[PDB]
Amino acid sequence: ELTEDMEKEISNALGHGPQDEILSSAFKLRITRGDIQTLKNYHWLNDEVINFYMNLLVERNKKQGYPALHVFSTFFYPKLKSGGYQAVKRWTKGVNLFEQEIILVPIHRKVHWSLVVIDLRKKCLKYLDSMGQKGHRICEILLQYLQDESKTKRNSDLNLLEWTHHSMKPHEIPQQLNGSDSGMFTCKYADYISRDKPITFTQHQMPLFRKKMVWEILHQQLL
Amino acid sequence: DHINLKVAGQDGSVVQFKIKRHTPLSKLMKAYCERQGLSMRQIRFRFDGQPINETDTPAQLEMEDEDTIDVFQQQTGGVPE
Numbered sequence: 001e002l003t004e005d006m007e008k009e010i011s012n013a014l015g016h017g018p019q020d021e022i023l024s025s026a027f028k029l030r031i032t033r034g035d036i037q038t039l040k041n042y043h044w045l046n047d048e049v050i051n052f053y054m055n056l057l058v059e060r061n062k063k064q065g066y067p068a069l070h071v072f073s074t075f076f077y078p079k080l081k082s083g084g085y086q087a088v089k090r091w092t093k094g095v096n097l098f099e100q101e102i103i104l105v106p107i108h109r110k111v112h113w114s115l116v117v118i119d120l121r122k123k124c125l126k127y128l129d130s131m132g133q134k135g136h137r138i139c140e141i142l143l144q145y146l147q148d149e150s151k152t153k154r155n156s157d158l159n160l161l162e163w164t165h166h167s168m169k170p171h172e173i174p175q176q177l178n179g180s181d182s183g184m185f186t187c188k189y190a191d192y193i194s195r196d197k198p199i200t201f202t203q204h205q206m207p208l209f210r211k212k213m214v215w216e217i218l219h220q221q222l223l
Numbered sequence: 224d225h226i227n228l229k230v231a232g233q234d235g236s237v238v239q240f241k242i243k244r245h246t247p248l249s250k251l252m253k254a255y256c257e258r259q260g261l262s263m264r265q266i267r268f269r270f271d272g273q274p275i276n277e278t279d280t281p282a283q284l285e286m287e288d289e290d291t292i293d294v295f296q297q298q299t300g301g302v303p304e
Contacts, residue, residue, distance in 0.1 A: 019264070028274040034264070044301035047267070073272050075295050091272035112303035131303050180301035 001223075002211065010214045014040050024218050027055040031217055038183075039214045041207060045113065045183030047074040050106055052217060053187050057104075057194045060222045066195050067101040067121070074106045081141060085148040097149055104190050105142060109133070113183040116142055117193055125165035128193075130176040130185035139165040177203040184209060191222075226281050230255050230268075232294045242281060249277035255294070267295040 002010075013023055019034035035048040054071040061069045073091075080088050097103065103118035115128040116138060125143060127135030143165065147158045176185050184206050192199045201209075216222050228251065230238045238258065240251050248268075252275075256263055268275045270284055270292055 028276060038299070044299045047298040073269070074298055075267070075269060075293075076272060079272075079293070088272070093271055108298040108300060109303060111300055113300035133303055176302070178302075182302055183300050 002208075002215075006215050007211070009218065010211055013214050013218060024052075024220060026220050027052065029055070036214055036217065039210050039217075041210060042178075042180050044111075044180055045187075047108070049213075049217070050074055050113070050183060050187060053213065054104060054106060054190060056216065056220065056222055057191060059220075061194055068099070069102050069104065069194050070095070070097060070100040071104045071190075072106065074108050077105060077107050077138075077142075080145060085145060085152070088145075089152065092149065092153070096153070097146070098154070102194060104194070106186060106190075107135075107138065113186040114138075115186045115189050117190075118142065118146070123163045125163070127165075127167050128173055128186075128189045129168070130174070130182050130189075132170040132175060134167065136165075136167055139167075173199050174202050176206075181206050184213075187213070226286065226288050226290075228281065228286065229289065229291045230294060231291050232259065233296060237291075244282045244286075245280055247278050247280055248275060252277060261294075265297050267297065269293045269295060 013033065013036050017033050019032060021033040022030050023033055023036055024031040029048060029052050031048055031052055035046060037043065038045045038049055051074055058069045058071055061067060076088060076091060098120060101121050103120065105116040105118065107114040107116055112131065114133065114135065116135065117126040117128065125139040127139055129135065143160070143163060147160065150156055150158050173189070174185070176182060181203070188201055188209060189199060212223050224244055225241055226244050228240045228242065230240065236259070238255060242251055252268055270286065275284070275292065
């Protein structure tokens with residue numbers, strides 16, 4: 001499924017060369033060779049690669065007719081947890097969250113990547129983690145955020161009684177078996193959940209996924 | 224004309240700047256790095272959660288007086304402790 005020229009192109013992007021060389025530009029982001037290399041085996045993905053891919057999921061969904069998706073920046077959560085609604089209020093200029101269906105919130109833990117899914121169509125939150133960490137409290141903060149967004153942007157409070165939030169069972173969602181693919185799991189969780197697809201991948205696919213993601217980023221086209 | 228932007232880092236610092244609404248923000252960003260002892264590669268300038276390009280201008284981004292530009296450090300991740 002990966003042409004010999006696709007591989008030759010991926011190999012070229014991951015190979016030797018200056019850090020700063022820009023290899024793909026879109027969404028006001030500039031993915032340099034240094035960013036792309038975090039996609040090498042055993043390497044830790046950075047915010048640039050994740051925000052970029054997340055932006056691709058939104059575009060892909062619009063093009064292939066999947067649910068209206070909205071993705072927050074990897075910087076949103078930390079900013080929220082530290083300055084509350086006021087610090088992130090304007091981060092939604094001219095876009096009504098509630099006109100969306102699936103909302104993705106990437107979550108950066110000091111040295112680990114995580115994902116929160118807000119399904120407006122079912123009014124339920126879900127925390128996804130490849131290393132089984134807990135996130136009940138993260139969803140609470142996010143839900144409170146929605147409430148404040150609703151009252152502040154469309155003068156009407158959410159009926160919290162309708163929303164429900166369940167943390168995913170380590171035996172339901174695939175877990176990572178090593179020490180460096182949490183960023184990858186986060187992106188692939190988001191990918192499958194954006195398409196309402198059962199998360200059926202395993203740690204075994206990660207290497208190919210990594211290879212494919214560099215091609216997908218350079219070509220700004222998913223596979 | 225002249226506008227005043229505030230650059231706020233994650234460490235609680237705030238740096239005041241004065242620029243014309245039609246000046247590309249490049250010089251401001253570069254100056255910020257120099258003063259704060261930061262490296263462009265490792266940080267991220269954001270205006271209301273959106274990234275800023277050196278070629279962007281306060282006008283093109285519709286910035287008002289006393290508006291704030293946020294600065295973030297890079298994030299990396301593989302496994303938790």
